[PDB]
């Protein structure tokens, strides 16, 4: 009863960061050390737990969130960070307990002419609360004039496309990111390492 980590990490297509994908993991055993042992990931950082301790600990629930962002935006996937991704697309709580994994995905997510399928939120009236997800496409009202669905002066479409080109630099590469959240809830432990 191994946890389907290959379902999320080795999935063919990810979601846009504004509409990131969530998968609930329970009722299985997972060797997290095997995940780090493969060295294909560029970022592997954990908060509240050490990587070796994962196999020696149990949790009520596990949550795997998957999306694609830019390279220099991977630093935004961390507690207390700011920026358009952390404030408008995907926010992590200040007391986050879990891990963040990010790896380069240039050969798959980049296309000649620009890959215009991956989007992100540029404008929003207020910051997202932790783990919230906004997928509305209402015209943003940047000024006093009400837009009323009409895009134009001080009235912008809320989403902007990344446009990944294989020839891009390391900062503007498509990076696939997963976030593992670990939940202890005064309930039975359903996800455990080989302990």
């Amino acid at each position, epitope marked *: 009863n191994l946890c389907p980590f290959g379902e999320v990490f080795n999935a063919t297509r990810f979601a846009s960061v504004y509409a990131w994908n*969530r998968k609930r993991i329970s009722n299985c055993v997972a060797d997290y050390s095997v995940l780090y042992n493969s060295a294909s990931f560029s970022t592997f950082k954990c908060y509240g737990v050490s990587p070796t301790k994962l196999n020696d600990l149990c949790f009520t629930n596990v949550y795997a969130d998957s999306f694609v962002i830019r390279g220099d935006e991977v630093r935004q996937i961390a507690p207390g960070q700011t920026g358009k991704i952390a404030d408008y697309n995907y926010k992590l*709580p200040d007391d986050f307990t879990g891990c963040v994994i990010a790896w380069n995905s240039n050969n798959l997510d980049s296309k000649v002419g620009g890959n215009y399928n991956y989007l992100y939120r540029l404008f*929003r*009236k*207020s910051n997202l*609360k*932790p*783990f*919230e*997800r*906004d*997928i*509305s*496409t*209402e*015209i943003y*009202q940047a000024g006093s004039t009400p837009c*009323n*669905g009409v895009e134009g002066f001080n009235c912008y479409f809320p989403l902007q496309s990344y446009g990944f080109q294989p020839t891009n630099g390391v900062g503007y590469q498509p990076y696939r990111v997963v976030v593992l959240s670990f*939940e202890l*809830l*005064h*309930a039975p432990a359903t996800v455990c390492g080989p302990k």
Partner: antibody
Framework: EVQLVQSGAEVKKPGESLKISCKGSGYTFTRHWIGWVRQMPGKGLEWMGVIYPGDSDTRYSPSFQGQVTVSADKSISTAYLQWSSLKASDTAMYFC??????????????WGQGTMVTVFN | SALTQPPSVSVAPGKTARITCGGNNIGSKSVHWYQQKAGQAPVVVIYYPSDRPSGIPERFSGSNSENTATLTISGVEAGDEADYYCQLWDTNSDHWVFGGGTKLTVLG
């Protein structure tokens, strides 16, 4: 098991104060919204306000702002709704509902029984 | 902003019921649908697009147009008789907004 358990029904006179409690269990209380919805007998649902117990951020409806207070105590996983002076028009059911996250972000995924508040003159 | 629902809708068992919620640019905003049976607390039946909560049958679905959000129940059963509500998120003002409600009656 996610649950929102609300306080018992109340009978109060006009002008009196009232404070209803609403305790959450089975989930991280500080990582969700908690909102209050009013339902007059035989009428529709009306959102009143919302509080994020993580940082005590409060949002109020224009029709309810200033006439009612929403607060929370995260140490015991409870949210509070408070009136300073009740009116006969306040007789209604009051639901407290948890604000979802992820796909449930804009919705209220979990609800309590509701608290019946009767103002009797 | 005003969210408008027909006060009542009646269908025969086995057919399809469509409940409409109206407004200005609702087709671009996040709209959810709740069911409330008589004497019970409300229950979410549809989130935004057409994502269903865990345990909700596949006969419940949601669709949208520029000025309209529609909840569709195909093959209506008797137990589906209840009040249905559309709810708006309204990211402009951070105001959860509530429809008028529609009583879906299954003709028995």
């Amino acid at each position: 098991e996610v649950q929102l358990v609300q306080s018992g029904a109340e009978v109060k006179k006009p002008g009196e104060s009232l404070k209803i409690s609403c305790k959450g269990s089975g989930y991280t209380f500080t990582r969700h919204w908690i909102g209050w919805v009013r339902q007059m007998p035989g009428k529709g649902l009306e959102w009143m306000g919302v509080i994020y117990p993580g940082d005590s951020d409060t949002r109020y409806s224009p029709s309810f702002q200033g006439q009612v207070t929403v607060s929370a105590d995260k140490s015991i996983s409870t949210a509070y709704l408070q009136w300073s002076s009740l009116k006969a028009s306040d007789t209604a059911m009051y639901f407290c509902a948890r604000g979802g996250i992820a796909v449930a972000s804009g919705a209220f995924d979990i609800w309590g029984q509701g608290t019946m508040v009767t103002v009797f003159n | 902003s005003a969210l408008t629902q027909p006060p009542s809708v009646s269908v025969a068992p086995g057919k399809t019921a469509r409940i409409t919620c109206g407004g200005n640019n609702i087709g671009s905003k996040s709209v959810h649908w709740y069911q409330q049976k008589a004497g019970q607390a409300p229950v979410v039946v549809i989130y935004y697009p057409s994502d269903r909560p865990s345990g909700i049958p596949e006969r419940f679905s949601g669709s949208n147009s520029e000025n309209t959000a529609t909840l569709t129940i195909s093959g209506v059963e008797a137990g589906d008789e209840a009040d249905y509500y559309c709810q708006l998120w309204d990211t402009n003002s951070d105001h959860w907004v509530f429809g008028g409600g529609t009583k879906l009656t299954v003709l028995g």
